[PDB]
Amino acid sequence: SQFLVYKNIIKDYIQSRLFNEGLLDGPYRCDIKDVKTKKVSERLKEVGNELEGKFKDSFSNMCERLTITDTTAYPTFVGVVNELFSTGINWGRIVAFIVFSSRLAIHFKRNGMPEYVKSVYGWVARYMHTKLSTWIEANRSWDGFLDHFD
């Protein structure tokens, strides 16, 4: 059920971020029943918000620099994220990956690609499931994430 855990984490992250941005169609509500997954999500929102704020200007204009269209959106996502992890995986980089993905979703909502927001959830879940899963489990999974940011 690992792809779905990742999908629910990124969905929660992005829904909360869109809500705060005034872009969420309807109310924010967390649907995560697993107490531990909820704790993971809450911490990820906290550290992602902190990372984004520390580099607000960079994250704000990132998607504009990429000249995103419907046809280049996924290839650009894969290209950016592959480059990010090509010189290593760590938890800070995973957070930056999540923040970038949320900025993509904001870009999509604001620049007339709102239907692609739900695609981000699947893109991130698939990326985590295929390319980061081995690393994540080798680094004690979400307990290692929570330890790292304590």
């Binding site: 990132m62 620099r65 950016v80 480059e83 990010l84 800070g92 980089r93 957070v95 930056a96 790292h148």
Partner: peptide
């Protein structure tokens, strides 16, 4: 040299930089 590679490399440094605090 691509904007894709430029932005990915940038994100890597942002994540590395962000991590320092938490081992300090």
């Amino acid at each position: 040299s691509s904007p894709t590679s430029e932005i990915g490399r940038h994100l890597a440094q942002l994540g590395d930089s962000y991590s320092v605090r938490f081992q300090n």
